[PDB]
Amino acid sequence: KQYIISEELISEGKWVKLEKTTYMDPTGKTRTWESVKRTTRKEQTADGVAVIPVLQRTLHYECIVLVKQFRPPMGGYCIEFPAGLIDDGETPEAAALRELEEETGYKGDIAECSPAVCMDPGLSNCTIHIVTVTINGDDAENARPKPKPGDGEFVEVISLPKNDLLQRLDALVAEEHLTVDARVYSYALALKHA
Amino acid sequence: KQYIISEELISEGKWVKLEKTTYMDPTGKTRTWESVKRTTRKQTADGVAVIPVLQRTLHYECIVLVKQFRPPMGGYCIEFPAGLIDDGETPEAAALRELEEETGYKGDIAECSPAVCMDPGLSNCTIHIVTVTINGDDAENARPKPKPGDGEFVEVISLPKNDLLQRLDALVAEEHLTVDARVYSYALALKHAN
Numbered sequence A: 001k002q003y004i005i006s007e008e009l010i011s012e013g014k015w016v017k018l019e020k021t022t023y024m025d026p027t028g029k030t031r032t033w034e035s036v037k038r039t040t041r042k043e044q045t046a047d048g049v050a051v052i053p054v055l056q057r058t059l060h061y062e063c064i065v066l067v068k069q070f071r072p073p074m075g076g077y078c079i080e081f082p083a084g085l086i087d088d089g090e091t092p093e094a095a096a097l098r099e100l101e102e103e104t105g106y107k108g109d110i111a112e113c114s115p116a117v118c119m120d121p122g123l124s125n126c127t128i129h130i131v132t133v134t135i136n137g138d139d140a141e142n143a144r145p146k147p148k149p150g151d152g153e154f155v156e157v158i159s160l161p162k163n164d165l166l167q168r169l170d171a172l173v174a175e176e177h178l179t180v181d182a183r184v185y186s187y188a189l190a191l192k193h194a
Numbered sequence B: 001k002q003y004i005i006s007e008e009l010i011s012e013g014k015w016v017k018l019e020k021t022t023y024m025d026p027t028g029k030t031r032t033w034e035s036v037k038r039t040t041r042k043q044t045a046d047g048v049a050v051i052p053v054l055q056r057t058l059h060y061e062c063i064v065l066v067k068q069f070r071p072p073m074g075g076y077c078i079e080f081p082a083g084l085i086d087d088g089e090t091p092e093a094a095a096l097r098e099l100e101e102e103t104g105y106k107g108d109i110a111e112c113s114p115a116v117c118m119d120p121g122l123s124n125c126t127i128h129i130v131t132v133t134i135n136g137d138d139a140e141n142a143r144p145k146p147k148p149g150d151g152e153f154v155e156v157i158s159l160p161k162n163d164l165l166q167r168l169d170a171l172v173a174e175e176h177l178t179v180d181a182r183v184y185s186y187a188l189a190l191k192h193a194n
C-alpha cells in the first residue's frame, strides 16, 4: 500500500546526508519524513556488518568477543559487536572476517550470515549483515592475537562468557560511564530468556 | 582519554540534525565525525523498544512484533513495538503505552535495560529495551484493541519464541521485509543459547 514518492536532498556531508522523504500513506494521503542515509553505499547488500564472534576453547566456557571504542556521535565509550562498513566489492562474510581480525586480532570461521537488517528504521536507511563467526581459540593463530587497527581506530577487546553475558555487561556499566549497544543487549537478553 | 572538543551544527530539521563533531583521538590528534542527533530528546533515552512475550497456556510462547512502512527504509520493516518517550514519561510507562497503542496488548513489566545505543558510529540515539510479559489468557488481552495515533499504520505479527529466527527468515524470504537488527540479534541468541 505505502511507497516513496520523492526524496529531496536537504544537506549532504562527506559521510552522511539528510533527506526529505515524501511518501504515500495507506489512507491515500501524502506525508513527509526526515531520513538519514550514508553517502558510502554503492552496490553492497548493506552498509555494514556486525560480527557475533563466539570464542571456543577446550575446557573454557564459550565467550562472546566484544569491542569498546570511543564513539564521537555518542560522546563516550560504547561496547559493541566488532563491526565495519563493507568495502565496494567485498562480500558481507569477507568484511566480517576482515573487521573481526582488524579489531580483535582473531581469525574466525564463518558460521552464518543474516539478511540485511535495519539499524534504526524510523530514522535511517542504514543496514547491516549480522555475521556469526566461531573462533577456534585452541588454534595457534588465535593464541596471542594482535589487533591491526586502521588509521584513527582505537579498539579494546572484551571477551565475556556467553553463559553470564548480561550480568557481565551490567557489571561493566556499573563500574564506569559506558553505553552498551542495543544489539549486544538484545542478544544478552535472549541468552537469559532462553 | 578521548573526548569531544566541540560540535558544529551542519543542518537542523524538525526531527533530526547533523553536526560536525570535533574530538581528541588518544594520540592527542584532533579529528572530526559527522554525528546525527534527534531534536526531540530532553529523558533517559530517546525511545523505548518493547520485547513483548505473549504467554497463553497450552500454546507456544510468542514474541509480538510489528510490521510498518518505514520511510527512511523505502519499505516495510519488522520490529519490536517502540516509540519515543514523552516529556516526563518513565521508560516503563512509555513501554506499556506504546505496546498498547501499537498492539492493543496490555502487559506487565519484567525488566528494563539501561540506555543502549542504536547506531553509535552514526547517531547519539538511545533506547531502553523493556521486557514485558502479556498474560494472553486475561480478558483484557482477548480481542486486543490497538490505538494508532495520527499517521501510524501498524500490523501485528506474533511469532513463536522457540523458532523465532527461522520464522523471521521465512518472512524475509516470502514477503520482502527488512527485519530489525535488534529483533534479529535476539532471535539469534535464542538459537545460540546453551
Ligand SMILES: O=C(c1ccco1)N1CCN(C(=O)C2CC2)CC1
Pocket (backbone or CB within 6 Å): A031, A032, A033, A034, A035, A122, A123, B015, B016, B150, B151, B152
Ligand atoms: O520526519 C519525521 C522524523 C522522525 C525521525 C526522523 O524523521 N517525523 C516523525 C513525526 N511524525 C510521525 O510520527 C509520522 C506521522 C506518523 C512526522 C514525521
Ligand SMILES: O=C(c1ccco1)N1CCN(C(=O)C2CC2)CC1
Pocket (backbone or CB within 6 Å): A015, A016, A151, A152, A153, B032, B033, B034, B035, B121, B122
Ligand atoms: O565522519 C565520519 C562518519 C561516518 C558516519 C558518520 O560520520 N567518519 C567516518 C570514518 N572516519 C574514520 O574512520 C576515522 C579514522 C577514524 C572519518 C570520519
Ligand SMILES: [Cl-]
Pocket (backbone or CB within 6 Å): A193, B053, B110, B131, B133
Ligand atoms: Cl520473560
Ligand SMILES: [Mg+2]
Pocket (backbone or CB within 6 Å): A082, A083, A084, A103
Ligand atoms: Mg568498527
Ligand SMILES: [Mg+2]
Pocket (backbone or CB within 6 Å): A083, A084, A099, A102, A103, A150, A153
Ligand atoms: Mg574496523
Ligand SMILES: [Mg+2]
Pocket (backbone or CB within 6 Å): B081, B082, B083, B098, B102
Ligand atoms: Mg512505534
Ligand SMILES: [Mg+2]
Pocket (backbone or CB within 6 Å): B082, B083, B098, B101, B102, B148, B149, B152
Ligand atoms: Mg505508538
